[PDB]
Design a protein around this ligand. Structure first.
Ligand SMILES: OC[C@H]1CN[C@@H](O)[C@@H](O[C@H]2O[C@H](CO)[C@@H](O)[C@H](O)[C@@H]2O)[C@@H]1O
Length: 349
């Protein structure tokens, strides 16, 4: 078929599975969240917590689906239908190495639901405690062993793909052990080889040798807020792509519809990026496509704390907070606008 509605398997949407309800999980997990103290605000702060009541949740926006559980198979069905509407073929699942049965259950449910809609799943490896290249290898082996034969497990030209958040927390000399073909604990040429996509943060003078010396297969930028880092400044994307092509690396720029995290980080208002009825998202997505990249990542499906979500949001005013909403746009606007951009991306590919 050539309908302009099919999923794109070079489009990765960052997905969070940490939401809970009292009924399913025992607590409205993540809807309730600690408020971060101001890192520049001195001692004795007692910032408090957002309780995750119906009236007061840990987001500046409010989900159409309410205070949902990421373990609810019925929510997962709805999310997969939202991915189909957005044309986003790959769900990039946050992974925190919780080593708990409720994690394991959730991952299986997500894979199952994704497969019903021909969506694929890859893992976004977060900065879990004592993360290092040895336990990363062990975890990559575990994930490929547990999930690699699931029909929804993502591969690109035969290889799994992992995004590695805050990959700069690990020295290139350690990464080389895992990612060079000659490395002491290499995954190259093994059953556990994968495309490893590191987080490009700062200036080229630092990041170019880091990526090369660490032997990453590519890089992404994550942040939805333009200008937060060099990497998340879209005017740099043409030159980042040129370098990537010259050095055999895969650049997967991250685009998002806005940013606001001031319910949980009230001191972080300088990072706010206004959605302007979709114009911010359009500008950022256009820059990614114009850079001539092979793959794009979306920050985010549902990082509600950071206000980067494309998941449907609804107007809501409670006695405790007046939420932001999609303003002049309908709740599913960011899903259908994603589909528009996926089409433009495919037209350019
Ligand atoms: O997925 C990468 C990165 C994206 N921003 C945050 O989701 C971050 O997690 C940390 O912040 C959230 C609140 O925004 C918090 O709930 C988590 O426990 C982390 O501290 C992700 O690593």
């Amino acid at each position: 078929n050539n309908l302009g509605t099919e999923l794109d398997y070079d489009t990765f949407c960052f997905y969070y599975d940490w939401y809970g309800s009292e009924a399913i999980d025992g607590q409205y997990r993540h809807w309730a969240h600690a408020i971060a103290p101001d890192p520049n605000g001195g001692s004795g702060q007692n910032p408090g917590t957002i309780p995750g009541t119906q009236e007061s949740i840990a987001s500046n926006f409010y989900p159409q689906l309410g205070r949902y559980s990421s373990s609810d198979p019925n929510i997962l069905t709805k999310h997969m239908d939202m991915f189909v509407m957005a044309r986003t073929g790959v769900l990039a699942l946050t992974w925190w190495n919780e080593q708990d049965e409720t994690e394991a259950k959730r991952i299986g449910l997500i894979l199952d639901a994704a497969d019903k809609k021909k969506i694929k799943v890859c893992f976004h490896l977060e900065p879990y405690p004592s993360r290092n290249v040895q336990n990363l290898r062990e975890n990559i082996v575990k994930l490929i062993t547990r999930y690699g034969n699931h029909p929804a497990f993502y591969r690109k030209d035969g290889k799994p793909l992992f995004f590695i958040y805050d990959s700069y927390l690990i020295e290139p000399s350690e990464w080389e052990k895992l990612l060079s073909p000659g490395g002491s604990i290499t995954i190259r040429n093994t059953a556990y080889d994968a495309l490893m996509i590191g987080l490009w943060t700062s200036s080229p003078t630092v990041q170019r040798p880091f990526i090369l010396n660490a032997h990453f297969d590519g890089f992404y930028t994550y942040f939805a807020a333009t200008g937060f880092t060099y990497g998340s400044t879209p005017t740099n994307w043409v030159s980042m792509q040129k370098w990537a092509k010259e050095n055999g690396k895969i650049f997967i720029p991250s685009v998002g519809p806005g940013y606001i995290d001031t319910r949980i980080r009230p001191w972080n208002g300088s990072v706010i990026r206004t959605r302007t009825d979709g114009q911010y998202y359009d500008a950022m997505y256009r820059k990614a496509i114009e850079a001539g990249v092979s793959a794009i990542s979306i920050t985010s499906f549902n990082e509600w704390h950071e206000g980067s979500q494309i998941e449907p949001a609804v107007p809501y005013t409670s006695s405790e907070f007046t939420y932001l909403d999609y303003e002049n746009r309908e709740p599913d606007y960011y899903l259908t606008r994603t589909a528009y951009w996926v089409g433009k991306f495919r037209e350019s590919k």
